[PDB]
Amino acid sequence: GVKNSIIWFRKGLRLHDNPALLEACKDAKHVYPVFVLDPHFLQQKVSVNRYNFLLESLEDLQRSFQARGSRLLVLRGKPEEVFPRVFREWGVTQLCFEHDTEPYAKVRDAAVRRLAAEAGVEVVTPISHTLYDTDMLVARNGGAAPLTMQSFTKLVDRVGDPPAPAPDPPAAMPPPAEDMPSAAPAATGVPTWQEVGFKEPPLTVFKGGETEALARLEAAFQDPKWVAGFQKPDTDPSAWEKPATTVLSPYLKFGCLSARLFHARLLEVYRRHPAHSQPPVSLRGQLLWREFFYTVGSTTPNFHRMAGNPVCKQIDWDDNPEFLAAWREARTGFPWIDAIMTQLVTWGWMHHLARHSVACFLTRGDLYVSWERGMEVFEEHLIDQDHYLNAANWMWLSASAFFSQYFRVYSPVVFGKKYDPEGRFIRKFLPVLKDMPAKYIYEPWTAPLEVQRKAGCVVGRDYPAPIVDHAVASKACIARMAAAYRRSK
Numbered sequence: 001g002v003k004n005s006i007i008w009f010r011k012g013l014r015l016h017d018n019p020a021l022l023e024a025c026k027d028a029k030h031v032y033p034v035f036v037l038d039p040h041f042l043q044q045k046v047s048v049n050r051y052n053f054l055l056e057s058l059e060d061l062q063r064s065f066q067a068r069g070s071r072l073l074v075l076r077g078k079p080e081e082v083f084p085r086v087f088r089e090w091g092v093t094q095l096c097f098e099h100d101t102e103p104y105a106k107v108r109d110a111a112v113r114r115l116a117a118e119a120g121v122e123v124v125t126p127i128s129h130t131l132y133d134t135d136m137l138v139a140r141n142g143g144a145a146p147l148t149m150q151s152f153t154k155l156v157d158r159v160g161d162p163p164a165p166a167p168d169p170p171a172a173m174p175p176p177a178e179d180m181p182s183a184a185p186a187a188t189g190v191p192t193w194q195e196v197g198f199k200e201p202p203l204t205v206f207k208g209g210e211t212e213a214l215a216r217l218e219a220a221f222q223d224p225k226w227v228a229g230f231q232k233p234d235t236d237p238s239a240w241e242k243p244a245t246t247v248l249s250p251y252l253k254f255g256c257l258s259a260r261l262f263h264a265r266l267l268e269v270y271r272r273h274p275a276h277s278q279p280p281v282s283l284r285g286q287l288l289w290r291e292f293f294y295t296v297g298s299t300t301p302n303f304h305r306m307a308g309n310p311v312c313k314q315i316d317w318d319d320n321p322e323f324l325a326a327w328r329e330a331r332t333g334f335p336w337i338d339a340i341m342t343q344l345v346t347w348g349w350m351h352h353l354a355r356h357s358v359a360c361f362l363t364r365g366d367l368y369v370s371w372e373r374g375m376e377v378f379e380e381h382l383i384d385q386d387h388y389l390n391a392a393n394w395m396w397l398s399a400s401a402f403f404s405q406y407f408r409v410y411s412p413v414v415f416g417k418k419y420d421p422e423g424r425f426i427r428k429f430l431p432v433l434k435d436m437p438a439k440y441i442y443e444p445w446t447a448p449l450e451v452q453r454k455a456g457c458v459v460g461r462d463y464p465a466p467i468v469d470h471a472v473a474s475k476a477c478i479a480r481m482a483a484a485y486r487r488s489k
């Protein structure tokens, strides 16, 4: 005779702009904030940087629910086995969670709705992870998703502004009922990275949580001139003391920051700065790139692979395990490439143009290894790893989809020199080259043997030689891509 609701967290790890949380609290007697954790996830993939980022995001929710008289419940096990138990135990009448469009999510969410229907539980799945209803944009475009960014911008302009961010939850929330067995604090607490099974500590400098996301949002909007005149291709990839972009991707991935709140703050600045940048280079355009890849990926089968993907090109990539290990272990011999790969495993985040260099080097630029193999490396270490975004950009850099200018090959020796001629980005993440003069910091093998010894870095003993000559490798990759683009017909 009362409303007992469950707000199930998967993504959307936040309290602001959470329509699923608001519906769960309205006229609610008891609310159960639940996150389902599988304690056998490492026993099957995931770096300690991203998994601890998720754990720090749950601790942020825990302090937020406790300040409002509630408590976050971290249930162990699988959703299909735990929810039918807590439905009858807690007397649940309504289940609410943010809508997700990932392939594993749809199969998972379909089974839970079945279990909730057999238990008489109402299911409310509002859309708040993306800007718009991605299925509505497909219907408004005649039934198919746009394939070009120019056509996608014309579509979202006809639809209009995204929905406004939902209001904040009340200051006090209905707490979970007391003395419930499955709600015992000893078995529902937030674990640490040592308990889950990781043996190495995290090395990233980015802390998870809604509070840190909101702090990074305000820090970016403290200069409205910088937000308005933001142009993505003009940012600095070598900037590490202060990254050239917002670095809000790990918070938008886990849902620690609402994309609609991000978009709402952008329009406030744009209406006071009439000369603000326009898509696709604007800051608003970057959210559209996220929205554009989500719209195509959710409606494209096998979007994360090559075979069976209707939008990906069937290129005869090489199966070279030696080039993959050198690229994965950051021992390619090119300091600009090895520094970005060291930043991948240390911070779990790199600048967009920095990810352009290593993705072009592995695929259509030098090694000609499949973008699927490098995507497996990024998904392991990137703390902002997004299923649809990591794929469409790996297909962009490999010239398999969306992008088609394979004659444009980044140079692993000159690309980084234009931003950082002294190699400050290289000496930080590759301290073995910290005494190397700037004349040979990007090409250490060209330095004389007297200079290599005087800097404590002899090429071939302390730092590896380049695995390939870029001129020989790039000209070979470009010609093979041309033959690939001629067999497409």
Ligand SMILES: Cc1cc2nc3c(=O)[nH]c(=O)nc-3n(C[C@H](O)[C@H](O)[C@H](O)COP(=O)(O)OP(=O)(O)OC[C@H]3O[C@@H](n4cnc5c(N)ncnc54)[C@H](O)[C@@H]3O)c2cc1C
Residues within 6 Å of the ligand: 232, 245, 246, 247, 248, 249, 250, 252, 253, 286, 287, 289, 290, 291, 293, 350, 351, 352, 353, 355, 356, 359, 378, 382, 384, 385, 386, 387, 389, 390, 391, 393, 394, 397
């Ligand atoms: C090889 C490769 C792999 C990548 N994989 C991912 C991934 O798994 N997850 C991810 O979030 N981004 C990915 N990107 C896109 C891009 O690298 C990052 O979004 C960006 O570098 C993050 O920095 P930022 O948050 O400061 O970006 P900003 O310039 O601040 O952009 C703001 C937001 O817009 C979105 N965005 C920006 N650029 C892109 C883009 N090119 N495509 C889609 N959305 C974008 C992100 O949500 C980002 O937080 C990939 C790109 C490449 C080339």
Ligand SMILES: [Cl-]
Residues within 6 Å of the ligand: 409, 410, 411, 414, 415
């Ligand atoms: Cl270049």
